[PDB]
Design a protein around this ligand. Structure first.
Ligand SMILES: O=C(O)c1cc(OC(F)(F)F)ccc1NCCc1c[nH]c2ccccc12
Length: 281
């Protein structure tokens, strides 16, 4: 049905190809996934937002699951690498953050979580748009399907079984910091190394800042107690509006962590514009 054009990427869920519909000529991103889900997934075809990748078609044939997505040429990881020596201009960082919060507020309003946000899942086009892609919906929908931990919320790493929309805010805060500084904020290589990198920067959490943290499934009283280091070291250049918003995105307590909807009203976005990136395809 399709002419494979190139392999776009991997991820231990499946493989993604750029492909051309043999009959219509549409170029699409084709996701092959080896194996109540089929129904609720398919609902997403008609649930759409400018800052979410469009799921064109869902095809369950054989012992595999094919997902046909709209194709975009670039992602934020590639753009950030290409911008490492210059840095992404603040107005574009701001526009991207704003759009991603719009995308999250939409899918959170429909009670859909992403769960696995990372730069390489954020697609961008020549028109200044950025879109949520590669949702981690396998577990949530119950599909019978090396992992990056750098953007995982602390409640996930501490074994919370029933985590909330707040996990996506945490991940987006880590990406925000990375656009600003051009370095991953918390590049852990194990679940405990990820946790300890977070603690070394934001302080070991306790019941004062995060009620109930000490009762969490993987919390150990033996965790080292790091002081919180001053937040001025975290994303240095960024102005106080940006730092303020980031600090609310990185609150330990998911109940205190800012929502996508409230973050859209933060003063950091008072002068928000939509610049156009300069993309080499
Ligand atoms: O992005 C993927 O890879 C993916 C995998 C899925 O199930 C799995 F089993 F994992 F394959 C299911 C959906 C997926 N994307 C959904 C994108 C989407 C369109 N409209 C939406 C409205 C609100 C929230 C999200 C969306």
């Amino acid at each position: 049905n399709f002419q494979k054009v190139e392999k776009i990427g991997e991820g231990t869920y499946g493989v993604v190809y750029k492909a051309r519909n043999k009959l219509t000529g549409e170029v699409v991103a084709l996701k092959k996934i080896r194996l109540t889900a089929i129904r609720e997934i398919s609902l997403l075809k008609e649930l759409n937002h400018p800052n979410i990748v469009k799921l064109l078609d869902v095809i369950h044939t054989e012992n595999k699951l094919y997902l046909v997505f709209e194709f975009l040429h670039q992602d934020l990881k590639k753009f950030m690498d290409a911008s490492a020596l210059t840095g992404i201009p603040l107005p574009l960082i701001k526009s991207y953050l704003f759009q991603l919060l719009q995308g999250l507020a939409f899918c959170h309003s429909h009670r859909v979580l992403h769960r696995d946000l990372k730069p390489q899942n954020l697609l961008i086009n020549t028109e200044g748009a950025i879109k949520l892609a590669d949702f981690g919906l396998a577990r949530a929908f119950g599909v019978p399907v090396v992992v990056t931990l750098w953007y995982r919320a602390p409640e996930i790493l501490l074994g919370c079984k029933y985590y909330s929309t707040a996990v996506d805010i945490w991940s987006l805060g880590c990406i925000f910091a990375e656009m600003v500084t051009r370095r991953a904020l918390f590049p852990g290589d194990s679940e405990i190394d990820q946790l300890f990198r977070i603690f070394r920067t934001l302080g070991t959490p306790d019941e004062v800042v995060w009620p109930g943290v000490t009762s969490m499934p993987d919390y150990k009283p033996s965790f080292p107690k790091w002081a919180r280091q001053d937040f001025s070291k975290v994303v240095p250049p960024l102005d106080e509006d940006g730092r303020s918003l980031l600090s609310q995105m990185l609150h330990y307590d998911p109940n205190k962590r800012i929502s996508a909807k409230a973050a859209l009203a933060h003063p950091f976005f008072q002068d928000v514009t939509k610049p156009v990136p300069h993309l080499r395809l």
